[PDB]
């Protein structure tokens, strides 16, 4: 409760007061309606420029008509009135950036909302930017382990890839993305979680789960809750993207989750209709595709030459990346809607969650037939790449075979072999929440299935067999798991080592 300290903190703001005169461009408020303010006189205002109103309220210029300026308020607008002066700052929308944001909860403008003190960041950056061009990029060939075997084996994600999580309400879309953030606490990848249009108690519960699992110290949380201005909800994904890009441009890796791009599209539709811009396919703005394509093309992998040029030679021989996990909600499985149609056509893959599989107890609920990764085997370690080759298409063919042979009389050995194997891999892909698996744990599980060791095991015992096998290798083969976990390497020595351990396990436990 330290006296004198508070005084000197105040003296530091008094000492640095801008006592000199300033030349500014100005206007007057004409009308105030639904978060939209109209102004006369701002001759030099640029598009997307910040406007300064009385009492530290800020707006953004979006309509530069010949006789009027249409602005949106970056906070509460009900305190504004006709006749108030509107001023002009020669600066584009910027937010704080750096490692000082890790373990903090902030608003769409970067202000702390966690009450844990000030953010001593030493760098700001523009919210709206253009992604690095064709020649500055590098092919995706490094993994991003989510910790789920169904995703990491059949729909792999690489450093700089963009993978869509899509399904209906209440089927595990947030659970999949939050577990993927939790698994990065030891990977060396920084995390960003952007909450758009969510209730504040749901955001607080996600932060409590990140903290209880030890992942909060490696994550930046950007919040634009359901009661906040549609402008803040529209800008939040770009602010979070800018905070993630700080690591990419400096030869480091980052991961970003947009918990609801469909809520960002609804906020953008509101502003656009209130600015009186003409509507499209479902009252959505004409440029709703460009809203998401301009955001998602920033998530990328940049070459050593780009990082060396950005850092003025301070960082060399290192690539940088930003991986994205956008989320989209569908209505009763309808993908023909305008927003879902746009986003599926932009990402490097998608993970479809199915309510029928979720109700049937397959809880990660990943439809292997509809889900796909456009990077494939380049985003996997040597061991998972070899042990998972063809599993996705084999499960897709098993689902069809199970429906075709459902009421027919007993078939040939080729049909029984495929059906009995597909049933075991289907039961194996099931996993619990907040329980990620390492490369070695996923590898043992994949090896025991594809090498035929599960053929004698009952379907109702596959979960118990996997849990016991992992626990046994953790006690009696710890040095082998540590060797597989160094880089996910594979050779005849490791193959024979796993074989000998699984044989001894089944023959004695």
């Amino acid at each position: 409760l330290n006296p004198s300290e508070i005084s000197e903190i105040i003296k530091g703001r008094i000492e640095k007061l801008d006592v000199a005169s300033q030349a500014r461009n100005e206007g007057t408020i004409v009308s105030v309606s639904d978060g939209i303010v109209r102004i006369y006189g701002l001759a030099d205002v640029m598009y997307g420029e910040m406007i300064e109103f009385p009492g530290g309220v800020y707006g953004m210029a979006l309509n530069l008509e010949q006789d009027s300026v249409g602005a949106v308020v970056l906070g509460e607008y009900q305190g504004l009135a006709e006749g108030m002066n509107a001023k002009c700052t020669g600066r584009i929308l910027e937010v704080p950036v750096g490692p000082e944001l890790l373990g903090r909860v902030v608003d769409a403008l970067g202000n702390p909302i966690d009450g844990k003190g000030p953010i001593d960041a030493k760098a700001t950056d523009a919210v709206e930017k253009v992604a690095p061009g064709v020649i500055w990029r590098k092919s995706v060939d490094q993994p991003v382990q989510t910790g789920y075997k169904s995703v990491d084996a059949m729909i792999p994600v690489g450093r700089g890839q963009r993978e869509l999580i899509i399904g209906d309400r209440q089927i595990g879309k947030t659970a999949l993305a939050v577990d993927a953030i939790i698994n990065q606490k030891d990977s060396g990848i920084k995390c960003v979680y952007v909450a758009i249009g969510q209730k504040q108690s749901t955001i607080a519960n996600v932060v409590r789960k990140l903290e209880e699992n030890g992942a909060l110290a490696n994550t930046i949380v950007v919040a634009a809750s359901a009661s906040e201005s549609a402008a803040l909800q529209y800008l939040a994904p770009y602010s979070g993207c800018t905070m993630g890009e700080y690591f990419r441009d400096r030869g480091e890796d980052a991961l970003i989750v947009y918990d609801d791009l469909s809520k960002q599209a609804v906020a953008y539709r509101q502003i656009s209709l209130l600015l009186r811009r003409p509507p499209g396919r479902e009252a959505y703005p004409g440029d709703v595709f460009y809203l998401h394509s301009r955001l998602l093309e920033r998530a990328s992998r940049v070459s050593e030459e780009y990082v060396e040029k950005f850092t003025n030679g301070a960082v060399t021989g290192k690539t940088g990346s930003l991986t994205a996990l956008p989320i989209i909600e569908t209505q009763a499985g309808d993908v023909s809607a305008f927003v879902p149609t746009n986003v599926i056509s932009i990402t490097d893959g998608q993970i479809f969650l199915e309510s029928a599989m979720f109700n049937s107890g397959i809880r990660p609920a990943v439809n292997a037939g509809i889900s796909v990764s456009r990077v494939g085997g380049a985003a996997q370690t040597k061991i998972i790449k070899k042990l998972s080759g063809g599993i996705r298409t084999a499960l897709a063919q098993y689902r069809e075979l199970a429906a075709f042979a459902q009421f027919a009389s007993d078939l040939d050995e080729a049909t029984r072999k495929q059906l009995e194997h597909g049933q075991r891999v289907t039961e194996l892909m099931k996993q619990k929440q907040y329980a990620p698996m390492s490369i070695a744990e996923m590898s043992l599980s994949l090896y025991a299935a594809e090498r035929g060791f599960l053929q004698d095991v009952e379907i109702a015992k596959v979960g118990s067999f996997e849990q016991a096998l992992i626990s046994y290798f953790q006690r009696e083969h710890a040095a082998l798991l540590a060797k597989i976990n160094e880089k996910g390497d594979f050779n005849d020595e490791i193959d024979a080592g796993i074989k000998a351990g699984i044989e001894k396990f089944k023959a004695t436990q």
Binding site: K199, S201, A226, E228, Q270, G361
Partner: protein, 347 residues
């Protein structure tokens, strides 16, 4: 303005309702939000009046009831019922019913919530009940074109999600006190994909979805186990025994729903020996979910039943294990606890 991010409460304490389907698949929590979704004449008011009766058994604080755009007769019936029962001195009543102009129906929700926020901020634990939250949004649609706004999808106001968030975020528990809130949600033309119901799901901790197809079979309450859900349905909150019983019931009902078209064309006799046993248990589970209410006694004559969480889990676990495979399917319909199904089978 809504309470800040730093003022939020992390409560997970289970609230028993005494209603089997709700306590099994939709467990409620103290200081949380509940929503009752349903079309016209399916059970929203009857199921709310039964919840008002059961939660007041353990709760000792105050209640606030906001009537937003509904029947004036139902407000008169509820006022006299509480006055005759001496319950009235612990409830604040606010009304803006269907007879009222658009401005009244648009602001009544805020008036009732302002009274609940006073009691929460005094450090109390209060109940906030809303006759129909959809009417607040609808009153906004009637006025939107007159306010000069361009319409959005299906004629709704462009501000639909913001108008909903500005009200919904104030209805929350804080570090000072708690607000447990229950709201009825009308579903226009039975369409759950309609913009108003679709935008409401994200604001609730427990979602109870009522169905016209279930109500048509005779089952009351007409809840749908496969569409209804709660944030409290977690092994770390309710324990593994409850969680596995609820998951077992949902697996059986989901598999029965997949066979409906085959059973409709070819009948039950063509199914496998495994599917035949599962369909028989699905039919018993579906009937055991029914329960006669103490507010529904006037409609039929049957006395109401209160079933504990322990009795609820024991009944469904036994039906899943096969302990009741010999009893007839009609013995589970309208009987409260599982032991009463055994006595009903004797006739």
């Amino acid at each position: 303005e809504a309470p800040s991010y730093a003022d939020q409460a992390g409560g997970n304490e289970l609230l028993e309702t005494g209603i089997k389907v709700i306590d099994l698949v939709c467990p409620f929590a103290k200081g949380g939000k509940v929503g009752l979704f349903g079309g016209a004449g399916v059970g929203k008011t009857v199921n709310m009046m039964e919840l008002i009766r059961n939660i007041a058994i353990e709760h000792s604080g105050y209640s606030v009831f906001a009537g937003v755009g509904e029947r004036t007769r139902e407000g008169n019936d509820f006022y006299h019922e509480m006055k005759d029962s001496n319950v009235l001195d612990k409830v604040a009543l606010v009304y803006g019913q269907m007879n009222e102009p658009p401005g009244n129906r648009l602001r009544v929700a805020l008036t009732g919530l302002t009274m609940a926020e006073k009691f929460r901020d005094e450090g109390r634990d209060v109940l906030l009940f809303i006759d129909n939250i959809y009417r607040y949004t609808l009153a906004g649609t009637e006025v939107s074109a007159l306010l000069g706004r361009m319409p959005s999808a299906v004629g709704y106001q462009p501000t639909l999600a913001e108008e909903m968030g500005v009200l919904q975020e104030r209805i929350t528990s804080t570090k000072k006190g708690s607000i447990t809130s229950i709201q009825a949600v009308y579903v226009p033309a039975d369409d759950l994909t309609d913009p108003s119901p679709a935008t409401t799901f994200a604001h609730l901790d427990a979602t109870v979805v009522l169905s016209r197809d279930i109500a048509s079979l005779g089952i009351y309450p007409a809840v749908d186990p496969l569409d209804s859900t709660s944030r409290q349905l977690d092994p770390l909150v309710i324990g593994q025994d409850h969680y596995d019983t609820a998951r077992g019931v949902q697996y059986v009902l989901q598999r029965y729903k997949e066979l409906k078209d085959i059973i409709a064309i070819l009948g039950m006799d063509e199914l496998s020996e495994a599917d035949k046993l599962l369909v028989a248990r699905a039919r018993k589970i579906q009937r055991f979910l029914s329960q006669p209410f103490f507010v529904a006694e006037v409609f039929t004559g049957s006395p109401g039943k209160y079933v504990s969480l322990k009795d609820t889990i024991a009944g469904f676990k036994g039906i899943l294990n096969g302990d009741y495979d010999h009893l007839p399917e009609q013995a589970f319909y309208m009987v409260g606890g599982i032991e009463e199904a055994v006595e009903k089978a004797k006739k």
